[PDB]
Amino acid sequence: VRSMTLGNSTITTQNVVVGYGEWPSYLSTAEDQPTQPDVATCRFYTLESVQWEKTSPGWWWKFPEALKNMGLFGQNMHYHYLGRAGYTIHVQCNASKFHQGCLLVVCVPEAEMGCADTDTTFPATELTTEDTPHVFTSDSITGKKVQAAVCNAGMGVGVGNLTIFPHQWINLRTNNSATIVIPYINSVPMDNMFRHYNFTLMIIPFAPLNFTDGATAYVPITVTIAPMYAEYNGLRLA
C-alpha cells in the first residue's frame, strides 16, 4: 500500500505499464518558446466512479479534452492553443473477494471511430461528453452517432487483438488496480487540445462480472488521471 500524493491530491494505491517504454518528457528556440506550468496541473483528477454491472459492454474517454473542465488543466486549455502532457492513469476497481471478472484497460492513441450508419458523419458531441464516458453497445446501432458495438470497438478492428496498445488487465481474481503512462504520442511536437484527441482510454470487460444474490449488483471503477510534464506555448513577447 503506497499513498501517492501530487500537489493537493492524495490517492491510495496497491506494476506500471509505461506506454511504449518511454516516460513523458519536456520538448527540449527563441522563435517559439514553451511555458511549463508544473504548478498544479500535475495533481490527480479523479473522474466520476463508473458502476460495472453484469450487462456493461464497456466505456471510453477521449483525452486530452476529457479534462476540459478539470481545474487548472481544463482552464489552461482555454488560454493556450498548444500543449502536450503525459497522463498517468490509475484505474482501481475495489470489488469484493466473491466478485469475478476481467477488464482490458487500453489507451489506443489516435482512435478514429466510425459512424453508426455510414454515408454520413456524427455531430461531434457523440465522441465525447467531457467527464462522463460514452458506453459501448452489445450489438449494432443506427443513427448519427458512433458505431459503439464491441467486437468492433470503434475503429473497425477486432476487439480481442486490441492488446497491441499500452494495456493492462484487471483480473478481479488477482489484482484490482491498473496504471498506464502515455508519453504524448503525436506527429507534431505540440497540438491544439480541443481539435485533436491524442488517445482514447477505453475499458472493456472481456469476462463479464458475475456474483450471487447477496453481493452488490455492481463494481465501481475509479479512473484517475495525472497530467505529467504538461507544457504550453508562450504568451509573452520576445
Binding site: E110, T118, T121, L127, N152, G158, F194, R195, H196, Y197
Partner: protein
C-alpha cells in the same frame, strides 16, 4: 499440398521497408487529346493519398504514424498519327491546379513535371517527405476546424499533392484515348505506433465508417 519441414531462420522479409515498399497500381484513368476545348475529360487528377485501394490501405493502417519518400512510375498507353509526348505534372500541397487542359497553371515553374514521349522507358518521378509535421498520420482522431466543426478525421498534415496528366500535343486528326497507370511505391519508410489490423470491410475512401462484422468464421461447437 503436404506439411513439409520448413526449416530456416529469417525475418528480413518482415521488416517495414520489405513489407510496405512494393509498387502497386493505384490509379487508372482515361484522357483524350482533342475535342471539347472546355472539358474535364482531357486530363487526369488523382489527389495522392494512401487510401486509394483497400489492399494497400490495409497495410498502411497497421501503423499510426509513418514517413516515407514516394517514387511513382507511370505506365502510359494509347489507342485510336505522330509520336505522342505526355506531361505528368505533380503539384505540391501548396500549388495551383488547372481547370482546363489549356490552363496557365501547366506552365508554373514551381510545379515539377516530366515530359515523356512515347516509346521510351516509363517516366519516373520521385517526391520527398512533404508533410508539415514529422510523419504522415494514417488515423487522425480530431477535427479540422476548431471547436468541433465539420470534417472529422481529416488533417492537413497528411496531404501529399496531386498529379495532373495531359497530352502536350495540341490536336490530332483522329481521336487518341490514352490510359495511364500510376505505380505508387513507398521508399525509405519508417513507421511508429503499431495498430491492430482492419477487420471490417471498407465503406468509403475518406472515412473509417464500417458495418459491424463478426470476429471470426463460426464453427459448430466449441469442441469440434
Amino acid at each position: 499440398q503436404t506439411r513439409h519441414v520448413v526449416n530456416f531462420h529469417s525475418r528480413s522479409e518482415s521488416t517495414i521497408e520489405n513489407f510496405m515498399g512494393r509498387a502497386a497500381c493505384v490509379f487508372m484513368d482515361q484522357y483524350k487529346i482533342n475535342g471539347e476545348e472546355t472539358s474535364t475529360d482531357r486530363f487526369a487528377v488523382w489527389t495522392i493519398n494512401i487510401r486509394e485501394m483497400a489492399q494497400l490501405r490495409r497495410k498502411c493502417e497497421m501503423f499510426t504514424y509513418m514517413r516515407f519518400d514516394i517514387e511513382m512510375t507511370m505506365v502510359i498507353t494509347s489507342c485510336q498519327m505522330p509520336v505522342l509526348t505526355h506531361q505528368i505534372m505533380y503539384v505540391p500541397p501548396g500549388g495551383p491546379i488547372p481547370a482546363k487542359v489549356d490552363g496557365y497553371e501547366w506552365q508554373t515553374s514551381t510545379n515539377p513535371s516530366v515530359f515523356w514521349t512515347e516509346g521510351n522507358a516509363p517516366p519516373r518521378i520521385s517526391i520527398p517527405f512533404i508533410s508539415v509535421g514529422n510523419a504522415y498520420s494514417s488515423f487522425y482522431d480530431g477535427w479540422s476546424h476548431f471547436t468541433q466543426d465539420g470534417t472529422y478525421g481529416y488533417t492537413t498534415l497528411n496531404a501529399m499533392g496531386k498529379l495532373y496528366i495531359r497530352h502536350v500535343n495540341r490536336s490530332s486528326p483522329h481521336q487518341i484515348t490514352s490510359t495511364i497507370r500510376v505505380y505508387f511505391k513507398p521508399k525509405h519508410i519508417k513507421a511508429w505506433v503499431p495498430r491492430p489490423p482492419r477487420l471490417c470491410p471498407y465503406i468509403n475512401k475518406r472515412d473509417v465508417n464500417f458495418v459491424v462484422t463478426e470476429i471470426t468464421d463460426s464453427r459448430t461447437s466449441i469442441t469440434d
